[PDB]
Each structure stands twice: as C-alpha cells, then as structure tokens.
Design a binder for this molecule. Structure first.
Ligand SMILES: [Cl-]
Ligand SMILES: [Cl-]
Ligand SMILES: [Cl-]
Ligand SMILES: [Cl-]
Ligand SMILES: [Mn+2]
Ligand SMILES: [Mn+2]
Ligand SMILES: [Mn+2]
Ligand SMILES: [Mn+2]
Ligand SMILES: [Mn+2]
Ligand SMILES: [Mn+2]
Ligand SMILES: [Mn+2]
Ligand SMILES: [Mn+2]
Lengths: 440, 440, 440, 440
C-alpha cells in the first residue's frame, strides 16, 4: 500500500479550495542535515512537503497559486539535471520530467527561486507561509516580499497578508484517507512482526541494542528502511526512563525489557510498545504490575470510539491504575480521594494517547487537556504504563519495574480498529511465545 | 578495544603542550539535530569534542586553561542533574561525577556558561576557538569576548588573539595511537564480516536495501550500532553513481552489485567496498573490468609505505587502468599519450585514497594533489574503481558496469597493514564463497 | 501649531476601525543609532510610531487590541522610571504617567515585553505587524508567536494571520488633517525664512557650508531644531549633482548656487529649493535656463488641483522644457518628436513631485508612473530643474549650470495652496532682494 | 590645521611595523545610517578607518599586507566610478585616482571584495580584524576565511590566527602627533568661541535650544560643520541631568544654564562645559557652589603633568569638594571621614577626566580606576561638577543647582597646555562679559 500521484494532487486541490482568491501557498522541503563533518544523515523530507508531493529531494519548493475562484495552478522549484552532480550523488528528477511525474503544472530550477518567486507573488493579496519553520525558507520569502515592497517604481506590489497554513494543513493530516489508513495498517503489521521477533530472540546475556538490531532488520526486510523514531530498549531499571535510547546494558535473567519501536513505511509511523520478561517468565511482582497496565489498555481499546475523548478514556485508566496500586499496597488510602489528588502521577506521568501519522507525535489540535471529541479517521496510540522507580517508597519487590504496553488504533464509525494486535500482549501468550522460541 | 579515560587525558595534555601560556582552548559538543518535527536523529558527538573527552552528551563545552608554562587545568560545562528530564530523556552525568569519570578538574552547569565563561577568559592573551564550526558556539564565545572588551571599568580584559585549533588538532588526529589502530582494526573486522554476509545473502530478486539490512544487522551484533556513512548498494547501472544511497531497485540476475558500507565502532569508521555478481558468477565482460580494478588495488597495497604518497601510488594505478582499458578497446591510442591526456577520467573520476578515523573522510592535510609523504600511523582507504556509463561510447558489453574495490590500511614502519583483507576480493574467491552459500 | 494628544488618539481609533475583530496592531519605536563609538545621533522617532503617539522615546511599543467590534484598548510598553538612568541620560515618562499623558489605557515596562506580549496576542485571530521594518521588532514578535505556537499544552494559541499595517497607515498619512496642514504651513514658512536669509547672506568667497549654517540657525530660532534631510548647497558645477551635500567649495563670483533645504517642525518636513546667483546678478545664459525652470514651476502651480495627476502635470512641464531647450539650441529637432523621444532626460532626470509629510519623501501610493488622481489633503512638492553637465554637447555658455526651483503645496477643493511662496523666485525679485542686502 | 596624506601613510606604516610577517590587517569604513525611511544621517566615518586614510566614503576597506619583514603593500577597496550614481548622490574617488590621492599601492572595486579578499588572505599566517565592530564586515571576513578553509583542493589555506588590532591602534591614537595637537588646538579655539557667543547671547526668555543654535552656527562658520556630540543646554534643574539634550525649556531669570558642547574639526573633538547665570549675575548660593567647582578645576589644571594620574588628581578634587560642601552645610561631619565614605558621590557622580581625540570619549587604556601614569601627548578633559538635586536634603537655597566647568588639555613635557582657556570661567569675568553684552 502507498499514496499515489493522484492523491497528492487531490490534497493540493483541497488546500487550494480553502485558500483565498488571489493568493499563493509556499511549502518548502527539509534541509539536508550534517551528521559529522562532510557526512549527512539519511534525508528525511518535511512531513507537510511530503504530504503534498511524495517528492524526496531537498532544494525544492511547491508553490500553489490561486489566481481567482476558478483558476489555479502549481509551480515546483527543484534541482536542475546536472551530469556531474548526479554521477556523484544520485539522480535528480529535474524540470522536464517533474510536471508529469508529480502532477504539477510547471517546474523551475531551484537556483532561480530568487529571480522567480517575487514574480509569482507580485500583485497577490495573500501569501500562505509557515513562518519560522525553516530559516532558509524565511530568508527566501522575506527577500521576495522585500523586493515587491520596494519595487513600486517597477509596478510591483507585495501581498500584505501572510497566513500560516500549518493549522489548515494539520487539520487535513488529522483525518486519514482510506489509502492512508491502508499504509498505516501495513506499518502496524511490519512493526508488530518486529516486536514478535524481538520477543522470540531475546535471551539473558544479550545486550539491549541486540534487540534494536533484530527490530531494524525486520523493518528493513518489509521495505521500511528507517524507524519512525529512535528505538527504546529499556531493561530492568532502564524501563523507567521513558525515552531510553542508550540501549547499552546487558539484559539480565529476572528483569523485564520494555521495547518501544516503530517503523516508517511510505512516510507513516508505526509505534508499538511491548514489555516482557528477559527470561520468558514473569515473576509474581512483575505480573501484578503488568496486569494493571494490560487492564488499562484493554479497557481503553473497548472504549475508544467516535464521541468520546482521550481525556474521558484517561479518566477510566486512572481509576484502574489507582485501584490496582491500592490493592498491591503501592498507594494507600481511599481510591476516589487518591484519584482527586492525582496520586497515580509518580507512576504514570505521561499521556495515554497521541495522534499518529506522517509524524509519530502527529499534528492536529488536541483541545484543552486532550478533550477534543474523536471522529472517524483519527489515528492514535494507546499507551498506559506504570514505572516504579528503584528508590520508590513502595513494597520492595516492585522497585525498578517499568512497564508500558502500546497499540495503534484508527477511529471508525463503529468504534476503533486495532492496527497492532498481531503482536501478543496477554501475559500467558507472551510466555507461550517465548517458551516456544527458547526450546528451538 | 576502546579508547580509555587516560588516553583522552593524554590528548588534552598534548594539546595544552602546544598552547601559548596564558590561553584557553574551547571545544564544543555537537548540537542535537531534528529529523522531523519533535523527533531527533540519533545523537552524533562532534569528532573533535569526542577525541578529547569520550563524552556523548550535547550541551557540553570543554575548556582547557593554560595559565602559564607549568600550570594548567580543565573545566567541563555540561548538563545538570535533573530528575524530571532524566526520567523522560535519559541519565545525565552531571557536575559531581564528571571530574572523576572524565578526568577533568572542575565541572560546571551548561546553563551557567554565559555567567562563567567570560570569567575564565578574563586576562588571558589567547583563546583557541574553532570559529564558524557551530553557530551556537560562536554566539557564546562572541558574547563572552564582548563582555570582556566592554568591561574595562569592571577591570575585565579580552584576549586579543583568537587561534583556530583545528589545524593542530587535525594533525594530532592524522597520526593514530596503537589504541586507535586497535579500534580501527576491530572496525575493519566488523565491516568485513558484514560484507561477507552480504555476499552470502545476495540473490537475484532481493532489493538493494535488503543487503543494507543484512549489513546493518551485522554491524549491530558486534556493538557497532550505527554506520559511519550512509550505505551504498548500487546494482547494475546504479553502481556507476558513486554515492548511490536510494538502494531501491530489485537486483537482477546478470548484474553486479557494488556495496560501499562501513561501521562506526567506538567513534571510528570502517569503510569497505566490494563489487560482486548478483547471481554468483561474473560474466566475461564483468570479469575483464574487475581484473583491472583488482590489479590496481593489489598493486596499491604492495606499494603503500612510509616515504611514498597518495599521488605517487595514484600514478601507478592510472597506468594500470589506461593499459587495461586500451587492451579491451575502451580507450584507443598510445598508453603514455593517453596517460598524459588523463584519458582514464571518464571512467575513474575520484581519488584513490582518503584518510580514515573518527570521520570516514578524516581530517588532516593532504598536500597539493595529495602529495604529502606518508608516515607510520596514518590510516587511509585504497579504492580504485571503473565506471562505464550506460551510454558510454565503448564496446557495448561494458556499458552500465560500475566496479569499486576498497580496503582500509594503516601505514607501518615496514609498509602497511590491511585492516579489511578478511573479506574476499579475488574473483575466484568471491565466486566460491557465493557458490557455497547458494547451495545451502 | 502642533498635533495634540486628542489627534493622536483619533488616529489610533481610526486604525482600530479598519482592523478585524480579534486582532492586535503592534507599532514599534525607532532604535537609537550610533554615530561613532559610544556617541549616538540625535534621536529620530519612527514616523509611523510618532503618527500614533507623539512620543519621542526609544524602547517603546504601542499595542492596539481590538477584542471585538465594540471593545478595544491600548497598551504602551515604555522605559521604566530609573533614578540613575535619568540623572545621566534624561527624564523618562514611565508607566504611571503614560496613560494620562498619551491617552492610552495601560502602560507596561519595556523590559517585560517578552513576558507580556505573548499574553496579549494569545487567542487572537490576526496580528498587524510591519515585518522587516526593524530587526529588533521582528525578534520580539517572532518570539511571542513561537511561544504561542508551541504552547498548546498551556492552552496558548497564536494568531495565524499577520497583516502589514503599512499600506493602511500610509494611506492615512497621505491625507492630511487641517491640524497637519497647519503644521506643514508653519514648516513652509520657517523653511522660506531660511532660504530668504541664505540669499541675503550669500557673497562670493563664502563657502557652500556657510549657507547651510545660516539656514540651520534660522530653522532653530523658530523651534525647528533639525533639518528634515541633509542640506544641499551646490554652487557652480555642484548644482548638477542632485543630492550634493559635501558643501565644501568656495562659492565663486559668476556661479549660481542651488540650495535644497527643509526644516523638520513637529515631525513634519518643509522642502524648498531656490537657485540664485552668488554675486546677485544672473548672467544672460543663467537667466535663459532659469526662465525655463520658472515657467515650468509657475505652470505646474496653476495646474495642480483635484482630478489631475503628477503624470499629467509632468507632461506639461516636459513640453515647456523641450520647447525652451530647442529655442536655445541645447536640443535640436521637432518639439513633438523630441518629446516622444524623451529628449529632455539628459537635463531633467528626476520626478517633478513627491509626497510631503512626516517624511520628506512621504509615504503613500503614487500609482503607475505617478498617475494617481489628486484629491484634497494631499501635500506634495513641485520641483522642476535643468542640469547642464560641464561636458554636455551644447552651446558652451550653458555648461555647468544646475537650476532647480521647488515649492511645497497642498491640494485643496479649489486648486492648491502654496506653502512656500514667501521666499521669492522671480529672477527680478531675487536680484532686487540680493541688491538690497549687498548694499547693507 | 589638518592631517595630511603623508601622516595617514606614516600611521599605516607604524601599524605595519607592529604586525607579524605574513599577515594582513583589515580596516572597514562605517556603514551609512538611516534617519527615517529613505533619508540618512550625515555620514560619519569610522574613527579608526579615518585615522589611517582621511577618506570619507562608505563601502571602503583598507587592507595592509605584510608579506614578510621587508615587503608590505596596501590595497583599498572602494566604490567604483558610476556616472548615474554620482549625478544623484555625489562624486566618488574611484580606483584610478585613489592610489595617488590616498597614497595606497592598489585600489579595487568594493563590489569585487568577495571575489578578491580571500585571494589576498590566502597563505597568510595572521589576519588582524576588529571582530564584532560591524556586522557587515564580519560577514565579509568570515566568508573569505570559510572559502580558504574549505578550499584545500584549490590549494587555498586560511590564516589560523586572528588578532584584534583595536588595542594596538587605540594605543597609537592615545598619543597625539604635533599635527594632531594642532588640530585639537583649533577645535578648542572654535569651541571656546562658540561658548563665548552663547554667554553673550543668552537672555531670560530664550529657550535652551536657542543657545544650541548659536553654538552650532559658530562651529560652522569656522569650518566645523558638525558637533562632536549632541549639545547639552541644561538650565535650572535640567543642569542636574548630565547628558541633558532635550534643550526644550524656556530659560528663567534667576537660573543657571550649563552648556556642554564641542565641535568636530577635521575629525577631532572639542569638549567644553561652561555654566553661567541666565540673567548675567550669580546669586550668592550659585556663586558658593560655583566657587567649589572652579577651585577643583583650577587645582586640577595646576596638577596635571607627566607622572601623575587621573586617579591622583581626582583625590585632590574630592578633598576640595568635601571641604567646600562641609563649609556650606551640604555635608556634615569630619572631612577625612566623609572622604573615606565617598560622601561627595551624591553631588559629583561622574569622572573628572576622559581622553579626547577622534572620539569625544576617546580610545585608550585608562588603567584600574583611571590610575595610568600620564605621559606627554595624551589629551584629556578636566570636568569637575556639583549637582544638587531639587529634592536633596540640603539647605534649600542650593536645591536644583547643577554646575560643571570643563576644559581640554594636552599633557606636555613641562605640565599641560590648556586648549580651551580662551572662554572665560572666573565668575567675575563671566559677569563682566555678560554685563557688556547685555548693554548692547
Ligand atoms: Cl537548481
Ligand atoms: Cl544545565
Ligand atoms: Cl524598561
Ligand atoms: Cl563598487
Ligand atoms: Mn511508542
Ligand atoms: Mn507513542
Ligand atoms: Mn567506501
Ligand atoms: Mn571511502
Ligand atoms: Mn527639495
Ligand atoms: Mn523634494
Ligand atoms: Mn563635555
Ligand atoms: Mn567631556
């Protein structure tokens, strides 16, 4: 599953529909990023630029011009064909091929952007520009507008109104098309396969980074070359560090390992967390905490649907957590009083859910305290966890346990679809999977 | 093999030895780098900062103060301990532990750098600073010097002399210690294991990126988590693109694949290229070009030694290439006349060798046309290649063949040591390796 | 005559009337400007900031908030009272006194602008800001908007629309109130007195700068402390340099001197040019050129009125010039053909008229080729000139003559009012004035 | 008196003498400065650039190249000849005429600086550059050095050492040549004539700014077109504001007026303060404070000589002030105890003396607490004052009196020469001067 030329074109047209007549929208590619000295990180296109183009080159700018309410057209600035540069660094689309390949009306050399952009903006009323997104883009836009402002004797005029297109575009991205959901479904499947592999490979004595290696290899073999975020493999006390990425420790017999990892497939993020015993068998203490986190996730998966909110479901999870922690002696007191005091916060200190899409922490307005009412087409994670610090003032068998269990879901008319249920999470199913692997 | 605290300390002392009395040297950590939105690439420390510290955190500055010819001391600025930040993002060394851990005299919070740096520079004659390396560092240094310049009524004075420490430091890095050579030797071994695995796994129908996945997994399993540069897997015509990293094509029965890949192990780069038949058997045309590139590499490996130069060895390779290309009818004319015309350049358009170390294209002065006389302790690649474009005006059986064969060597008293000879390169040995794998 | 608090308030309200509901307009003071080292030029407030405040301090920002269509208010950020700073550098209005003095609702310390501005912009739909006017202002505004954009978890939101208020404000400034016209009338009178004095003082042997001194002293004695632009005193060949300000030469018996000078009175510019003989008597050649420029000015003064344009009047002047130059043998050919070829351009190479107000080259849209139809309340200069270069291919008696004659006018319902006719310009009247002075 | 081409050349050679072999010094002109919109302040050349050139154009850079210990040469970058630009804005020296006019070896167009500067710096060991002086200059220098650093394959190398030439140059400026002293002597005479005129013109009812007008006219008529700093005319309570420049009040019968004003003559500053009665007659209270300030100045003028310091002379002034203030009942207690408590500070809160030269607050190291030992050739002001605030807790007849009396001196072998004693300061002489004027 992928997103096709015609869908990128539909998206551009949907933005044009929202624009004022006599306007232009400017969407800039990501800069290349140095890793060290003259070496660069693998290129990651800007998510918004990608959303409107599917074009993976730097030094490119998409310009959508809405001349009036019926007439509009698109211009791409992009790197010119250059034999020497291409022999060295890779093929370039160039100007001749771009209109057909991408479905834009005109293509111009990026090297000419300063000579041409002001001409495209001249006489318009509004420019849509994400000011502050990139320094290089602000320089280009500000230079064009200055030329126009100062150019009255050459009959030039600048648009006086500049509108940030991010809010409009991010609201578009918040609601996925069926084709996007298909891509996210495949991302979920690839990511789940990777997590299953990690559980089947894990043995005491392996290092945390070895599971990262298994995961990344599995992503790759399905055509997801890069993770959507840096893989977390936190064993023992490291599982209490939410974004632990050192992944440097030897995994010990008797510890849990928490793996939070997701692929990037056709631009879209998977995002799964599974926690499991390094030696294949939960201890009683580990199982007691695990059961609370799993009940939280299972209840959330039952509840999420159009018309509820992340805030509402979070309230249900908090009750499950406080109730469970009271039963184990980790919290002491009346459950409702403890809930009123947010007594769970030392142990569950992050949000339950975030949007998912072209970014792992995807764009889109959450509302105050994540109260926005859910509607079909929204995609989000569901990620309860409990983290009992090594020095917590709790019964000592619970100290140093960090557990998170996370699935990705899409809100549907009828509830939600779980995109990542193909990797096990019930403790008996985890143990059975690991027992079978450990016998091989 | 690794580099230890005491070696980082020796390096700092060796820099201090070269500094003027009444001076300070400022070495800044790399900034964290955005991948997309709020997600960052995996952190890569600045190579020079790493060289003097082995410290892998951002927001850190090493200050070496040479008060006079006998007295000197070191101050590290680094992130403070912070419970919330560490629960979220990872452990921090902090100030209390840093002096013992890193072997520096004093540690201060990075948040106090603007309040403290000018005090350390006050009254000194010289500041050593890599101006232009990082914007954030230039802002900090310029602000400190401005405070001092403008502070005469507070009895402050700025050093009037600013010296770029890069030339001195880069000359230090050019000559490896035995411990560095041991780390590079292990990097070479890990990288060679990865290339052997790729040859044993490659089959027609696999995608280029699948070999990247095999390679990266092999790096990981030996504790080299990240490549030293973006892996190149160029099959067929893609092998004629020198830094081809799209790695997107299905590898065809009858094509060669060129793999240029290297690990990063304890900061140091491996860098190997091997080219081999996708189907396990060189065609006659492929073998004819391969033999020329291999003779070039084998001759270079015989020649490299103290007292010669990259330029001198390149001359020998050019003769081998022109002679071989004349024999095949790719070039026509008198060999010496063709050499005088640089007639090989359409087919071999890059350098034979680059320095290798903490960067894959390592630091250090090459001399005009890479004429610097080689001495023991220098580490470099040896990478002849021939690239016959699909539209080259040559006998048609050679079109679209790209071959490079690259090893990493250290110059020794007695010649060179080849760090990467544990992956095969003779064509009969490649074929035998692949035949054995293909039967499994 | 001056502009009063109540008029500044009316102007602010007139801007608020044009603003969208749920918006804020930000108008920033001018920075102080270094002359050399720690010394600054005399402060000149930004004309737009002045227009809305009459406040002559730096480090001040006017914020007009239109909460909805009935409710609006104003906030000034300005320097705090500070005993030491005021003992040294001058009194400050401060926060307590500002609301009453300036007629604004609230005043806050400029030192708190970054802590407070984002709070004023939070939740608004539109911000009016002159982007690119001042770097320091762009930094403040961009920082506030970034805080709001990144502050969703603190329930902050940024206005997505930014509108340049310059076009609206500059159209306001283009049409003067009766009180503004009264101030400009006084500026015209002061400037005319200064030009009369210069004619009465001028003698062969004085330096050009001596007339500048007379002019500036006369401005000062009427309470116009500063010129509106750098005074031009171009004698002989220097009169052919349009903005000649060196004013360094000894004025010679037999040369003309061209003086272009204007005062700044309560912020508003006068702008007069007079050309006259250094020795009190025009030569025949000087009179011949002078008569053409004077006819051009006199005809323009008859013509300017509502419903014509600068372009239309310029056409009449060009005909007068070409006709006159043909009669003298400076141009050769058919008058209408010469007009069609713009044959006057080597001798009259600037515009006839510019707007006049808080800036000498005042703000406001001219239309293509200065074709905008004139309406009552517009104020403009009328400044024909002829400049015959020392090396011009013309009869030799005309070489090195530069003549410009310029008056300031206001367009009225009934034609125009000449604000600067109190300094003579008819050649016989100039000669009589100078003869009378020279006898004293 | 002026500074000539040969002296500017001597200064350049004296700097070259101090430079390391294999170096270049870069000295940049001042930017032009906006006053409002498209109008600029009158140009003021950078004092250091002026010191080495006497060249009054922007867009100019002096490059002094010391190739080795015997060979050196100079290159000027400056604006090209341009007929249109010169017709509009003034004559330009250009490249052809500059070598002879200024005494430099070569001149190049400023528009070519980026194409040429790196070529001049290539292969040098040291660049002398005033980093942070001007943004535009730092951009040019940093760009050149970056080209060289990155240009090893083009055989380019950057100087690794950058030295601020300000300390060396400012120490040169601190010691005046006889020709400089002659120019400062004329500046002192012009400034004194202006102050005498102000005393002779002052009448109750005139505004403070009227005396500014008289002063500026007198500067002008002697060929000092511009003041060296903004003129202070503080009458009554305004005399207690040290840099009062509003100059807006009507001067009252019974008040003093304090005038601090100085011309700029051939680049050099005069700087005189005189305080005198608006009505020509000191009151008893005014005379009592005046006598203390005058004794302070007269004693300082007796004492200043080689081998003392500003700090030492200040101690003598403090004793005079405390003793005088005790006698009047403004201070109460034991004189030596009061001196130990710095009890004079509420009334004398500034320094006695500053260096004088191309800047009014001239360059040069003062030493801690202005303790540097004076030597012949140093030029400085001597400016005691007493300022009794309107709300001071002192006998009420002294409230609101601000008095400063300031002369300019040069340290000689034999003591000092007073450059400004031609304007009176003894109270009986002030009164006699004003009585004579008031009778006319
Ligand atoms: Cl391009
Ligand atoms: Cl910190
Ligand atoms: Cl403030
Ligand atoms: Cl130029
Ligand atoms: Mn996750
Ligand atoms: Mn997540
Ligand atoms: Mn390689
Ligand atoms: Mn290489
Ligand atoms: Mn004018
Ligand atoms: Mn004008
Ligand atoms: Mn003074
Ligand atoms: Mn002074």
């Amino acid at each position: 599953s992928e997103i096709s030329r015609q869908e990128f074109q539909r998206r551009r047209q949907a933005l044009v529909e929202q624009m004022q007549p006599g306007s232009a929208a400017l969407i800039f590619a990501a800069p290349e990023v140095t890793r060290s000295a003259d070496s660069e990180y693998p290129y990651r296109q800007n998510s918004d630029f990608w959303y409107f183009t599917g074009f993976n080159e730097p030094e490119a700018v998409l310009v959508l011009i809405k001349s009036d309410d019926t007439h509009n057209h698109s211009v791409l600035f992009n790197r010119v064909r250059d034999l020497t540069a291409e022999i060295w660094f890779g093929r370039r689309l160039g100007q001749d091929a771009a209109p057909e390949k991408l479905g834009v009306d005109r293509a111009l050399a990026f090297s000419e952007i300063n000579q041409q952009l002001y001409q495209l903006l001249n006489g318009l009323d509004v420019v849509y520009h994400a000011q502050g997104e990139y320094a290089y883009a602000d320089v280009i836009v500000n230079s064009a507008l200055e030329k126009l402002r100062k150019g009255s004797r050459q009959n030039l005029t600048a648009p006086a109104t500049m509108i940030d297109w991010r809010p409009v575009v991010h609201e578009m991205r918040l609601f996925k098309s069926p084709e996007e959901i298909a891509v996210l479904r495949r991302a979920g499947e690839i990511t789940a396969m990777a997590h299953t592999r990690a559980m089947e490979k894990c043995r005491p004595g392996m290092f945390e980074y070895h599971l990262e290696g298994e995961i990344h290899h599995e992503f790759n073999r399905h055509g997801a070359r890069y993770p959507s975020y840096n893989t977390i493999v936190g064993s023992g006390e490291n599982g209490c560090i939410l974004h632990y990425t050192e992944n440097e420790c030897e995994m010990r017999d008797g510890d849990l390992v928490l793996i939070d990892a997701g692929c990037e497939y056709k631009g879209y993020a998977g995002d799964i967390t599974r926690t499991f015993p390094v030696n294949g068998k939960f201890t009683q203490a580990q199982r007691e905490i695990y059961d609370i986190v799993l009940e939280s996730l299972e209840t959330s998966l039952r509840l999420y649907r159009p018309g509820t909110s992340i805030l509402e479901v979070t309230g249900e999870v908090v009750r499950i957590m406080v109730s469970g922690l009271v039963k184990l002696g980790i919290l002491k007191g009346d459950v409702d009083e403890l809930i009123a005091q947010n007594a769970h916060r030392p142990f569950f200190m992050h949000g339950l859910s975030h949007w998912l899409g072209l970014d792992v922490h995807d764009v889109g307005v959450y509302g105050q305290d994540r109260s926005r009412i859910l509607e079909p087409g929204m995609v989000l994670t569901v990620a309860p966890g409990l983290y009992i610090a090594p020095d917590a003032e709790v019964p000592e068998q619970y100290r140093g346990i960090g557990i998170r269990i996370e699935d990705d879901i899409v809100i549907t008319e009828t509830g939600n679809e779980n995109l990542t249920a193909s990797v096990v999470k019930k403790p008996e199913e985890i143990e059975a999977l690991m027992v079978a692997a450990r016998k091989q």
